Every structure is written in structure tokens, then in C-alpha cells.
mmCIF file of C-alpha atoms and ligand atoms in Angstrom:
data_model
loop_
_atom_site.group_PDB
_atom_site.id
_atom_site.type_symbol
_atom_site.label_atom_id
_atom_site.label_comp_id
_atom_site.label_asym_id
_atom_site.label_seq_id
_atom_site.Cartn_x
_atom_site.Cartn_y
_atom_site.Cartn_z
ATOM 1 C CA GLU A 1 -0.354 -5.945 -18.921
ATOM 2 C CA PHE A 2 1.482 -2.721 -17.711
ATOM 3 C CA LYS A 3 2.755 -0.545 -20.629
ATOM 4 C CA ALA A 4 5.089 2.494 -20.124
ATOM 5 C CA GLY A 5 2.784 5.540 -20.047
ATOM 6 C CA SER A 6 2.858 9.276 -19.234
ATOM 7 C CA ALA A 7 4.990 10.369 -16.206
ATOM 8 C CA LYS A 8 3.498 13.879 -16.548
ATOM 9 C CA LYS A 9 -0.093 12.657 -16.175
ATOM 10 C CA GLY A 10 1.150 10.238 -13.484
ATOM 11 C CA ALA A 11 2.701 13.091 -11.444
ATOM 12 C CA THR A 12 -0.680 14.962 -11.580
ATOM 13 C CA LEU A 13 -2.508 11.752 -10.507
ATOM 14 C CA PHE A 14 -0.049 11.410 -7.585
ATOM 15 C CA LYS A 15 -0.660 14.917 -6.157
ATOM 16 C CA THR A 16 -4.452 14.416 -6.531
ATOM 17 C CA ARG A 17 -4.844 10.788 -5.271
ATOM 18 C CA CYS A 18 -1.610 9.715 -3.339
ATOM 19 C CA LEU A 19 0.272 12.760 -1.881
ATOM 20 C CA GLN A 20 -2.464 13.123 0.749
ATOM 21 C CA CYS A 21 -1.070 9.950 2.489
ATOM 22 C CA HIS A 22 2.331 9.327 0.779
ATOM 23 C CA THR A 23 5.726 10.943 0.041
ATOM 24 C CA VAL A 24 8.183 9.918 -2.823
ATOM 25 C CA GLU A 25 11.469 11.760 -1.977
ATOM 26 C CA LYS A 26 14.561 10.008 -0.479
ATOM 27 C CA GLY A 27 14.218 10.083 3.314
ATOM 28 C CA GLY A 28 10.655 11.383 3.108
ATOM 29 C CA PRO A 29 8.489 11.686 6.245
ATOM 30 C CA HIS A 30 6.092 8.813 7.089
ATOM 31 C CA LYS A 31 2.598 10.408 6.532
ATOM 32 C CA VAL A 32 -0.810 8.514 6.924
ATOM 33 C CA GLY A 33 0.851 5.826 4.724
ATOM 34 C CA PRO A 34 4.556 4.909 4.321
ATOM 35 C CA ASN A 35 7.271 6.709 2.347
ATOM 36 C CA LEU A 36 7.218 5.077 -1.140
ATOM 37 C CA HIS A 37 10.969 5.664 -1.910
ATOM 38 C CA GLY A 38 12.614 2.482 -3.297
ATOM 39 C CA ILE A 39 9.179 0.707 -3.289
ATOM 40 C CA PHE A 40 10.038 -1.264 -6.495
ATOM 41 C CA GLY A 41 12.264 -4.006 -4.997
ATOM 42 C CA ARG A 42 10.911 -3.757 -1.410
ATOM 43 C CA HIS A 43 8.039 -6.027 -0.140
ATOM 44 C CA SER A 44 5.482 -5.820 2.816
ATOM 45 C CA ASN A 45 5.405 -10.854 1.298
ATOM 46 C CA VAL A 46 4.672 -8.919 -1.955
ATOM 47 C CA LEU A 47 7.754 -8.374 -4.303
ATOM 48 C CA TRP A 48 6.711 -4.962 -5.806
ATOM 49 C CA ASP A 49 6.802 -4.666 -9.625
ATOM 50 C CA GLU A 50 4.722 -2.617 -12.132
ATOM 51 C CA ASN A 51 2.067 -5.297 -12.836
ATOM 52 C CA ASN A 52 1.342 -6.379 -9.217
ATOM 53 C CA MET A 53 1.041 -2.701 -8.100
ATOM 54 C CA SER A 54 -1.313 -1.964 -11.075
ATOM 55 C CA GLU A 55 -3.534 -4.792 -9.623
ATOM 56 C CA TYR A 56 -3.078 -3.430 -6.030
ATOM 57 C CA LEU A 57 -4.000 0.192 -6.868
ATOM 58 C CA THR A 58 -7.125 -0.793 -8.906
ATOM 59 C CA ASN A 59 -9.378 -1.094 -5.821
ATOM 60 C CA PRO A 60 -10.351 1.858 -3.507
ATOM 61 C CA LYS A 61 -9.802 1.533 0.309
ATOM 62 C CA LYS A 62 -12.051 3.596 2.646
ATOM 63 C CA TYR A 63 -10.149 3.870 5.975
ATOM 64 C CA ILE A 64 -12.506 6.374 7.695
ATOM 65 C CA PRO A 65 -15.779 6.592 5.723
ATOM 66 C CA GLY A 66 -16.855 10.234 5.925
ATOM 67 C CA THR A 67 -13.388 11.871 5.987
ATOM 68 C CA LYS A 68 -10.629 12.360 3.345
ATOM 69 C CA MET A 69 -8.801 9.311 4.872
ATOM 70 C CA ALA A 70 -9.588 7.038 1.933
ATOM 71 C CA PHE A 71 -7.856 6.014 -1.322
ATOM 72 C CA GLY A 72 -10.024 6.466 -4.428
ATOM 73 C CA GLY A 73 -8.716 3.682 -6.637
ATOM 74 C CA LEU A 74 -7.348 3.838 -10.173
ATOM 75 C CA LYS A 75 -10.100 2.070 -12.183
ATOM 76 C CA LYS A 76 -8.898 3.405 -15.591
ATOM 77 C CA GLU A 77 -6.072 1.372 -17.164
ATOM 78 C CA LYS A 78 -4.386 4.506 -18.620
ATOM 79 C CA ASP A 79 -4.337 6.134 -15.127
ATOM 80 C CA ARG A 80 -2.581 3.145 -13.516
ATOM 81 C CA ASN A 81 0.055 2.958 -16.277
ATOM 82 C CA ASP A 82 0.506 6.759 -16.044
ATOM 83 C CA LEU A 83 0.831 6.793 -12.191
ATOM 84 C CA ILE A 84 3.192 3.761 -12.192
ATOM 85 C CA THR A 85 5.376 5.254 -14.984
ATOM 86 C CA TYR A 86 5.691 8.413 -12.833
ATOM 87 C CA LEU A 87 6.067 6.574 -9.529
ATOM 88 C CA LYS A 88 8.830 4.256 -10.896
ATOM 89 C CA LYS A 89 10.933 7.282 -12.049
ATOM 90 C CA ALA A 90 10.195 9.321 -8.846
ATOM 91 C CA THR A 91 10.935 6.549 -6.204
ATOM 92 C CA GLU A 92 14.664 6.259 -7.136
HETATM 93 C C1 HEC B 101 -4.604 7.421 2.486
HETATM 94 C C2 HEC B 101 -5.908 7.654 2.390
HETATM 95 C C3 HEC B 101 -3.889 6.755 1.376
HETATM 96 C C4 HEC B 101 -3.866 7.117 0.064
HETATM 97 C C5 HEC B 101 -4.602 8.264 -0.564
HETATM 98 C C6 HEC B 101 -3.037 6.205 -0.606
HETATM 99 N N1 HEC B 101 -2.487 5.281 0.242
HETATM 100 FE FE1 HEC B 101 -1.253 3.822 -0.194
HETATM 101 N N2 HEC B 101 -1.188 3.325 1.670
HETATM 102 C C7 HEC B 101 -1.862 3.908 2.687
HETATM 103 C C8 HEC B 101 -1.665 3.190 3.968
HETATM 104 C C9 HEC B 101 -2.352 3.600 5.255
HETATM 105 C C10 HEC B 101 -0.839 2.144 3.695
HETATM 106 C C11 HEC B 101 -0.294 1.090 4.663
HETATM 107 C C12 HEC B 101 -0.714 -0.369 4.397
HETATM 108 C C13 HEC B 101 -2.210 -0.567 4.141
HETATM 109 O O1 HEC B 101 -2.598 -1.313 3.072
HETATM 110 O O2 HEC B 101 -3.085 -0.085 4.863
HETATM 111 C C14 HEC B 101 -0.506 2.304 2.237
HETATM 112 C C15 HEC B 101 0.432 1.527 1.600
HETATM 113 C C16 HEC B 101 0.785 1.683 0.287
HETATM 114 C C17 HEC B 101 1.724 0.869 -0.405
HETATM 115 C C18 HEC B 101 2.501 -0.258 0.180
HETATM 116 C C19 HEC B 101 3.845 0.284 0.650
HETATM 117 C C20 HEC B 101 4.701 -0.759 1.357
HETATM 118 O O3 HEC B 101 4.169 -1.961 1.739
HETATM 119 O O4 HEC B 101 5.880 -0.485 1.579
HETATM 120 C C21 HEC B 101 1.815 1.329 -1.641
HETATM 121 C C22 HEC B 101 2.654 0.799 -2.731
HETATM 122 C C23 HEC B 101 0.900 2.383 -1.748
HETATM 123 N N3 HEC B 101 0.196 2.607 -0.550
HETATM 124 C C24 HEC B 101 0.711 3.109 -2.895
HETATM 125 C C25 HEC B 101 -0.244 4.151 -2.964
HETATM 126 C C26 HEC B 101 -0.441 4.876 -4.186
HETATM 127 C C27 HEC B 101 0.343 4.639 -5.455
HETATM 128 C C28 HEC B 101 -1.444 5.728 -3.950
HETATM 129 C C29 HEC B 101 -2.058 6.696 -4.825
HETATM 130 C C30 HEC B 101 -2.393 6.360 -6.047
HETATM 131 C C31 HEC B 101 -1.794 5.532 -2.531
HETATM 132 N N4 HEC B 101 -1.081 4.540 -1.982
HETATM 133 C C32 HEC B 101 -2.739 6.317 -1.919
HETATM 134 C C33 HEC B 101 -2.714 5.012 2.637
HETATM 135 C C34 HEC B 101 -3.009 5.633 1.469
#
């Protein structure tokens, strides 16, 4: 169900909802979460592709309720396709 979307809107969604814990650049520093470079091909066993990550990123995960250490989810379909379109181009 993933359809190539907007990398522009995806890049904005990354700085707002992912950058806080993750980095995309080659040889990026491990932050609260791992470096997502080369994520599409890598596993944990979960062979990362666009559709299985769209499912993964749909649900929010509160690590420390009360602080900004929590992922907010991507409940809108457009937002997931946008973020993945960006992320796919930026993690290689
Ligand atoms: C901190 C509050 C996080 C935010 C915001 C996002 N992620 Fe996350 N992510 C985080 C941690 C602590 C972990 C480790 C494993 C766990 O489930 O706890 C992850 C892991 C990922 C992964 C898996 C990477 C891998 O197994 O190599 C992906 C693909 C991932 N996170 C993507 C991702 C995206 C796209 C986010 C924003 C939309 C995002 N994460 C935010 C912590 C946090």
C-alpha cells in the first residue's frame, strides 16, 4: 500500500518527529535511537522495506511518559508515504 510521495514534506516530517532521536547521514552518530543510514536492506529479524516500515511507524511509542523521549506516530497515510519517500532517498 506504500505509494511514492513527497520527499520535501517527508524531510520536514523527519526534522519534526525523527531527528530528535535519529540521524540519516553516512557514519552518523548514534543518538537516543540508531543511525538510520542504509536501513532499507538491514534488519533488527525484520527485512526493512517501504511497506513494513509504514506499518512500523504508524503506532506511537512513549519511552518516558512526561518528557520529549517519545515517538508521536504517523497516523496519516500521506505522512508515512512522504516520510518514507524522503527517508529512502536520504539513507543512501
Ligand atoms: C525517540 C523518542 C525516537 C523517535 C522520535 C523516533 N525513534 Fe525510531 N527508534 C528509537 C529507538 C530508541 C529505537 C531502537 C529500537 C526500539 O524499538 O526501541 C528506534 C529504532 C528505529 C528503527 C529501527 C532501526 C533498526 O532496527 O536498525 C527505525 C527504522 C526507526 N526507529 C525509525 C524512526 C523514524 C522513521 C522516526 C520518525 C518518524 C523515528 N524512528 C522516531 C527512538 C526514536
